[PDB]
Amino acid sequence: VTNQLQYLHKVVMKALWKHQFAWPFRQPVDAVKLGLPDYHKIIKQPMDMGTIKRRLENNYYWAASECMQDFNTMFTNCYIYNKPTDDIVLMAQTLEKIFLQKVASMPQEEQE
Amino acid sequence: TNQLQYLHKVVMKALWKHQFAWPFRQPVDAVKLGLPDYHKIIKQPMDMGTIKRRLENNYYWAASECMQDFNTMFTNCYIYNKPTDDIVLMAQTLEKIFLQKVASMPQ
Numbered sequence: 277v278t279n280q281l282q283y284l285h286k287v288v289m290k291a292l293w294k295h296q297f298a299w300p301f302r303q304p305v306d307a308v309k310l311g312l313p314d315y316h317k318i319i320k321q322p323m324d325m326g327t328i329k330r331r332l333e334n335n336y337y338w339a340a341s342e343c344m345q346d347f348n349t350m351f352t353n354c355y356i357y358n359k360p361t362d363d364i365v366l367m368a369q370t371l372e373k374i375f376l377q378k379v380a381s382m383p384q385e386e387q388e
Numbered sequence: 389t390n391q392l393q394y395l396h397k398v399v400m401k402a403l404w405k406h407q408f409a410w411p412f413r414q415p416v417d418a419v420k421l422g423l424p425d426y427h428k429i430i431k432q433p434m435d436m437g438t439i440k441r442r443l444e445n446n447y448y449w450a451a452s453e454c455m456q457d458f459n460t461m462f463t464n465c466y467i468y469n470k471p472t473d474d475i476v477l478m479a480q481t482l483e484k485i486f487l488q489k490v491a492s493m494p495q
């Protein structure tokens with residue numbers, strides 16, 4: 277438990293989890309359900325806000341930057357795999373802007 | 389602001405001198421690269437040279453605005469290029485550093 281991780285849980289995750297574009301991101305991409313047999317050939321580290329939220333709730337992370345990298349991986353996976361014109365990309369872009377806006381006000385020094 | 393000074397002198401300086409940074413220091417030249425669909429796909433081009441100039445001319449009102457530009461630069465890369473292109477790996481490496489440095493930005 278640190279100040280920055282607390283910020284990431286109470287402010288960042290909170291804002292993103294409840295967002296109207298969040299639903300595709302709340303649980304891992306299900307390649308069988310979506311009919312996407314190449315998903316795991318292209319994305320090697322899948323990530324989603326369910327996993328991140330669980331990690332925050334279970335004090336999995338040692339540094340804020342580790343949680344931040346998971347958010348970033350989640351978004352990057354989306355941009356890499358999907359077509360440029362897919363709606364999911366716009367949804368990801370919207371959530372990521374909120375992520376960055378919030379991260380701009382995160383406590384600067386990690387103190388346990 | 390203090391934050392924009394940090395993005396200029398600590399964050400951008402670190403990214404700029406990185407060994408994977410050269411493709412990102414100026415706008416994508418679609419003519420020179422022979423990529424006639426680049427601008428049909430990427431509608432908001434961005435690069436660190438534009439960001440640096442914006443930091444130097446007091447263009448940004450807040451740190452958040454400048455962070456969005458970095459993000460757009462990286463997202464453009466992921467969206468346009470093939471998943472297996474080296475440039476994607478290069479962007480990912482630089483993006484990690486960006487976020488690492490951003491976490492220590494003055495509040």
Ligand SMILES: CC(=O)N1c2ccccc2CC[C@@H]1C
Nearest residue numbers: 300301305310312354358364
């Ligand atoms: C989050 C994501 O990238 N996807 C996703 C995840 C859940 C629901 C729909 C979609 C659209 C396709 C794509 C594989």
Ligand SMILES: CC(=O)N1c2ccccc2CC[C@@H]1C
Nearest residue numbers: 411412416423464465469475
């Ligand atoms: C930065 C970037 O995305 N590109 C770029 C920019 C400069 C030099 C090479 C490359 C590889 C293709 C791609 C269009």
